[PDB]
């Protein structure tokens, strides 16, 4: 009946003076916009249909046309920024917010979805949706004693839309909006649906991606233990944002990092640092690098959890981007660590894989490794065991690499190399 209409026919129906003809044409547009391949979004926009769709959102008397026009506009808004803008420019934002209070669940859900796409476009539209007052009615839909009574698809859509209100920076979302949303986010983070958990973690990862004050707003809510639990989930779509959030948190103060350690996070890293998904190993190693940039007692916990051999492992064999994070973890470790801690690193076999990476065609990692070697020598001086270290470096082919780096096409590289040779070799 409404399958594969031309845009011309859709226009004719929508321009008819007949609400039922309008409904059928709107449904025809929804089906076009919902097809698997290449929905004709620009053709619909060019036909001038958005303002009509927007006016149909207000037809309380005809719930089906509210639904079809909400779905059509959702799909237009799912496109490029320019396509999303066309929807906003038609006055869709307050019209969708009004539909949040609809007695028809499928309609309120579609309005949730549409606002998710609008907010998802970026900071400006996110903040505009917030200024039109979306947060109160969105949160009201979740004000039930038990989230399990809500339809699953419905809850997933709400969680996703709330995550887009938390998303993006320059600027970050308004502080008052974040405070308003957080208690519901905390509740969603404890829900048992894998998709809700994933999107809740994404939201938290967005909120902790910023300065220490933003991190603190989240940590103060007491979510770190739950994040660490999710860090151990079997589902990769949960582990990914949980790990990102944890990694963000440890970029904060030492006290914020300590909450992550206190919550048991380090016990998960044997698995994360050997995870078959390269992006998990990379993010886990980056996270370690920010833990080893912490206090000596925090470095000590890394030691106690047996994580130094795992860092040696990643340095020895991993995707290059991961090996680079490992190099950072080592340099941070060697900068902040005690002599005994630094010695331990050598006993775990750090020297040979460090030296092997000096043959890398990346100027930054070389500088990073050179700094580590310097820091390790410094601890060796305090023990009068410089020569023993020099031999280790010589035996594994390290001296050949450092000596060659004196003739390197970079000032900082050459200087650090020549200094090492003309002081220990």
């Amino acid at each position: 009946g409404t399958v594969n209409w031309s845009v011309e026919d859709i226009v004719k129906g929508i321009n008819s003076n007949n609400l039922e003809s309008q409904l059928q044409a709107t449904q025809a547009a929804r089906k076009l916009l919902s097809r698997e391949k290449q929905p004709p979004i620009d053709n619909i926009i060019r036909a001038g249909l958005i303002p009509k769709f927007v006016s149909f959102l207000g037809k309380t008397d005809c719930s089906p046309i509210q639904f079809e026009s909400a779905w059509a506009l959702t799909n237009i808004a799912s496109g490029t920024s320019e396509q999303t803008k066309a929807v906003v420019d038609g006055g869709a934002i307050p019209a969708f917010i009004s539909l949040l209070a609809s007695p028809h669940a499928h309609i309120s859900e579609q309005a949730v979805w549409a606002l998710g796409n609008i907010a998802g476009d970026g900071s400006a539209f996110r903040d505009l949706v917030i200024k039109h007052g979306a947060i109160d009615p969105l949160l009201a839909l979740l004000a039930v004693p038990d989230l399990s009574t809500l339809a699953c698809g419905y809850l997933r859509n709400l969680t996703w839309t709330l995550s887009n209100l938390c998303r993006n920076k320059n600027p970050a979302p308004p502080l008052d909006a974040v405070e308003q949303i957080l208690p519901t986010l905390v509740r969603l983070l404890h829900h048992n649906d894998p998709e809700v958990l994933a999107d809740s973690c994404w939201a938290i990862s967005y909120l902790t991606d910023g300065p220490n004050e933003r991190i603190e707003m989240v940590v103060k809510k007491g979510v770190v233990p739950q994040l660490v639990k999710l860090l151990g989930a079997t589902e990769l779509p949960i582990v990914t944002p949980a790990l990102r959030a944890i990694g963000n948190i440890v970029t904060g103060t030492d006290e914020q990092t300590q909450k992550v350690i206190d919550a048991g996070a380090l016990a998960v890293f044997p698995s994360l640092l050997t995870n078959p998904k390269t992006n998990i190993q990379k993010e886990a190693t980056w996270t370690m690098s920010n833990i080893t940039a912490g206090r000596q007692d925090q470095i000590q916990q890394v030691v106690n959890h047996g994580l130094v051999p795992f860092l040696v492992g990643v340095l020895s064999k991993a995707d290059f981007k991961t090996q680079k994070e490992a190099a950072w973890a080592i340099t941070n470790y060697t900068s902040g660590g005690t002599v005994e801690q630094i010695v331990y690193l050598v006993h775990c076999g750090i020297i040979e894989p460090l030296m092997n990476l000096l043959s890398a065609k990346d100027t930054k990692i070389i500088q990073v490794i050179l700094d580590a070697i310097s820091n390790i020598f410094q601890a060796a001086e305090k023990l009068g065991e410089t020569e023993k270290l020099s031999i280790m470096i010589e035996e594994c082919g390290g001296l050949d690499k450092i000596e060659a780096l004196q003739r390197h096409e970079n000032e900082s590289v050459y200087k650090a190399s020549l200094n090492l040779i003309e002081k220990y070799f």
Binding site: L33, S34, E36, P39, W71, T74, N75, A77, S78, G79, T84, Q110, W113, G116, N117, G120, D121, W160, N164, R167, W202
Partner: peptide, 7 residues
């Protein structure tokens, strides 16, 4: 993730 089309 940031935008979703309803199929």
């Amino acid at each position: 993730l940031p935008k979703r089309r309803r199929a």
